[PDB]
Design a protein around this ligand. Structure first.
Ligand SMILES: *Cc1c(COP(=O)(O)O)cnc(C)c1O
Ligand SMILES: *Cc1c(COP(=O)(O)O)cnc(C)c1O
Ligand SMILES: *Cc1c(COP(=O)(O)O)cnc(C)c1O
Ligand SMILES: *Cc1c(COP(=O)(O)O)cnc(C)c1O
Ligand SMILES: [Zn+2]
Ligand SMILES: [Zn+2]
Ligand SMILES: [Zn+2]
Ligand SMILES: [Zn+2]
Lengths: 345, 345, 345, 345
């Protein structure tokens, strides 16, 4: 197979062969609609096992929907949703959170590496509490792993959870790349979520191997009923649910999801180790997951561009490039990029 | 294969083997996200060919989303969406139209067989026009084929189109079962849509053979831009679009969609012909598509229920039963039901 | 003074001289804004006395705002607001309820004389309860006195309250013409509201004597906090609240409001007694409040129209006219209309 | 009269005696409702004269409503409303703009003295234009005079207008204190609005002398129709409009509004001139309107507080106090404050 030249995002990758085959297997026969079938029930039982707790699960088509739905059930229209200014909900959902929540307001809390600064968060969540002329603190959202591939430690997450419980705020986790942060920390799903104070999680699978299926995992099960209506009302209740369930079931079979995440993180780590010490190349950050950033010589950026590589190079500081690897990124794919970088140095 | 005992709805069926296999074929390699890939472009070209016109296409996860999105772009918040009181948008979307349109109001216009009465429609669309204290006529929605399996004729559709153009109202078609009405009429997609005045269509495929992929087909292309944002904002813009595109492409290959619709309609027609003249059985309607209604003796309803058949029997008048067939309903499946009806008579 | 020829509605009348003078008295000095002044506190204490209970009060600019705000706090976006099809919320608020509630859906329940039929209400409020694809029963709204001048008896109101408590539904009262129904029944404010099960009331004063000031009276005080934010968010929290408070205080001084209502009802009753037995004139209904309907000979309608009288005559059945009297309608004003009717018969 | 000790805001003042008397005069007789009366027509003609142009006028109860309504007609739900982070729409309307616009997003553009920095504005309004995943630039809002009493010059306003026309963005002016900036500049209403590119103005009168009546002045008259429905739908269409019209008519009679603004600005200017050179007192800014800020010795702040003065002293930097004067602030009121400041120094 020729080397895959795309490193723009993990969203360009396909799906593990086991996922597509699960769809084939489940394409025959009849099945109750809207999640009333056995496969769906099986998947829900799997989430309970995986999270070591009775949790409520709602499979939806996209991560944007998962996020907006979660947040809409955790804030009134006159409420505030605290998040990092570089978060996906504040930048790439065309205001989906604002839509689903019926006008809630996002309040940004800056911090290095796309992580909310705990001190600032503590200050913002106590602004004008009770003042009738001001929108009110309602919930907090943190992306795990972050939009730049950094990772909140178990201590940092739990710390945010303190502030949330302290001000009666809900805590949501945008886990579009949940698995990548999970395998980097080597902790349990439970330790990185409810045991740390998370109330709702956007369990991402699409970016880590499936076709199109995300899971809303509710730890604060009292929101289940509201969530059902909100999902349906937003047009996110799939009639032939087995086709979302089949994807996730495969995803959660034989530890496929974790293996896929390990391969993605392993690929970026390989890239960082190969880029360290090359002419006109400075790796930025620790490359904790499947996303790597590095400062490159412009001429080397054009050489990579001319070489047919797909990557972003204008969204941040001058000369800062971003390479994103996926579950399907082979060691070979990475070695091709390294070689082209070397040869272009 | 044993006989399929479910006739509750076509939404219990799986997917044509060609669809799942298309997903397998397209699960490898990389592809631009959010519909920027070649397969998606191919599918769009196919819609233009099929409809004999440059049309704008937006693939979405569900029919509820397709409907709500279409209607939201055709009415202001203070506008009215005219529809039959038995329509899906007025009953089974938990108010999705109201949600997406930011509060538009559904105005029902009754009529036999789930078809809007043209005279009543003409009267309702001219109520308080221009009155500041009243919501205003904005658009009209007709389900083709209807929720009860009846079909609007080309003349009836076009007639509704006159009223719409007359009052500057948009005309939307809920084509959840588009194909079933199309093959029953034997007309062209164009003749049953834009040539008759339709501005926006919810092109249904899920119920006729795919896993989960519907298509918003815009004939009034001036709404394209607004539709992009609305789709994204509602969380309905799938990142790995090839998995929706692959389904639809297969659906629109070798006339699969039409063949599937023919088989579904053929199955119901077989059932109606077998039920005609049996004890305690009166077939209601002409069974124009893949949905059949009949009045049955209660005892025969329990015998079918005890026989393990799945069907609705309480949603309408007393003793009125509904059997729905799908693209996968075999002549054998139908003959089993007929036999059980006979034996239970 | 010449006779007042307008009988279109009570909304054409001005304000009792005591109201305007209260504004004069309170136009000097300084006062805390947004209802934090003494006059406002005084008014709130008056509502508690008048209703013989601790109630929460929120003065707002219009009856449409009072209605929408009340209902928005009693129903989720996916909820249903039951009301008569001829109700103001379903006809003349350009969808304000739909707006404030973020998309809730009005469900009409017909009945003679603009009064919800209890049997139908009982059936509608138990439709698809718990069904995820359907909007849910949330609250009920009854207009007291109704839009046609009829009145719900204490028994009828309480009966609706049973259904509401039975299905955990909130009960709102549109009291745009609260006082007119109150003095017709001769009951206490408490007996016609909370003692009968009402949770929220749109206490109308504008139509009965003030310039522009309505009062949201909450008996279910647990909604107070939410109501504050909703009122502010909707732009209905007046900064110089004393100018709404001054109007209402005057309104509730020396039983002015009741006296005003008595005069309005007395005027319509005088008109009905004078119209009974005249050529080409049939009085319809019992004229329980300040609104009278009668069937008149077309030629007599033009004679009244040519005589300069203002009234509606096309909104109902053929030849059905509506005369509405106000707190300022003198016996003289009524005698002029009667004379012109006589002379035109 | 004893000295008025309140300087918290101009919203604590009452109304010019001419306003209350206008209400008295107009409290008798009958009048068409919802702005269909002669007084209202008269007022509209006055706005056209005052602005030297045919403009559309919509009188509403509050400034928050005026703002939200204006902005809702200038941005789609997926649009951006650019404003200063210290603006009223971004801080004290409990998200009214977000509510009325159905979820539009406020994008802050910082700058000294509550004035949007033109360079930053130019950069922000061209972010992700056309990108489907991002909310889009839609309109800009500037407060004239600003929330801190500063004033945009005719050149600064027009400059913002260039950017707006350049990117097809609407330009709204929050003129809560319109008159104060107008008399400080000595320009014409037209020069400070449409001649500089303003499309919609929240014409503030309440803070400058009336009881409760603001005016939405539309220079982009093509939005009139939409505005009517939006106003009604939001519950802001007063039935007895003459009571808003009477206030504004008085306000715009014998140059009362301008005289009132001159007195307010004159009072603050007197205060600044008296505070200049006193112990432990530093005046901040040029005091261009009716709002003054100064840094005071804590002990002097308690002495003023103990003296019974009402003012804010915690909302900004340490030791920064704010005194706001109104149309009713006499030279005497100001001399009392100066004396107490002196004696407390
Ligand atoms: C990719 C991503 C999402 C989801 O995007 P969709 O295209 O809506 O599925 C959400 N959050 C983050 C941080 C992401 O990287
Ligand atoms: C099945 C159906 C739909 C779509 O329902 P989803 O479950 O949202 O895909 C829409 N309209 C009609 C008439 C239908 O029968
Ligand atoms: C007059 C009236 C209202 C209020 O109308 P506004 O013009 O918004 O104050 C509300 N309900 C009923 C039944 C009315 O008659
Ligand atoms: C006072 C003010 C308003 C209006 O407030 P309301 O209480 O809603 O009338 C709006 N903008 C600014 C800048 C203000 O100072
Ligand atoms: Zn902790
Ligand atoms: Zn025709
Ligand atoms: Zn009872
Ligand atoms: Zn310029």
């Amino acid at each position: 197979r020729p080397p895959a030249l795309g490193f723009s995002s993990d969203n360009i990758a396909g799906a593990s062969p086991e996922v597509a085959q699960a769809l084939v297997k489940h394409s025959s026969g009849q099945a109750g609609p809207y999640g009333t079938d056995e496969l769906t029930a099986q998947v829900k039982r799997k989430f309970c096992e995986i999270f070591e707790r009775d949790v409520e699960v709602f499979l939806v088509p996209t991560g944007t929907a998962a996020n907006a739905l979660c947040l809409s059930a955790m804030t009134p229209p006159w409420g505030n949703i605290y998040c990092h200014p570089a978060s996906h909900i504040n930048n790439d959902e065309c205001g989906a959170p604002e839509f689903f929540s019926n006008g809630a307001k996002l309040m940004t809390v800056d911090g290095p590496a796309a992580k909310l600064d705990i001190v600032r968060l503590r200050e913002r969540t106590r602004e004008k509490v009770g003042d009738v002329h001001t929108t009110q603190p309602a919930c907090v959202s943190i992306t795990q792993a972050t939009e730049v591939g950094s990772i909140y430690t178990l201590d940092e997450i739990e710390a945010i959870g303190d502030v949330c419980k302290s001000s009666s705020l809900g805590l949501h986790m945008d886990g579009s790349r949940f698995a990548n942060a999970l395998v980097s920390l080597g902790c349990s799903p439970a330790e990185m979520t409810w045991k740390a104070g998370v109330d709702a999680l956007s369990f991402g699978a699409t970016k880590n191997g499936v076709l199109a299926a995300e899971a809303i995992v509710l730890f604060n099960t009292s929101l289940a009923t509201e969530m059902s209506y909100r999902r349906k009302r937003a047009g996110h209740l799939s009639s032939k649910m087995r086709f979302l369930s089949a994807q996730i079931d495969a995803y959660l079979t034989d530890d496929l999801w974790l293996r896929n995440a390990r391969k993605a993180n392993a690929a970026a780590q390989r890239l960082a180790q190969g880029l360290e010490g090359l002419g006109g190349v400075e790796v930025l950050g620790g490359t904790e997951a499947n996303i790597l950033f590095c400062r490159l010589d412009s001429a080397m950026i054009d050489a990579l561009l001319k070489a047919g590589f797909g990557f972003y190079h204008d969204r941040w500081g001058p000369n800062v490039v971003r390479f994103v690897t996926s579950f399907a990124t082979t060691a070979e794919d990475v070695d091709h990029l390294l070689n082209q970088v070397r040869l272009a140095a």
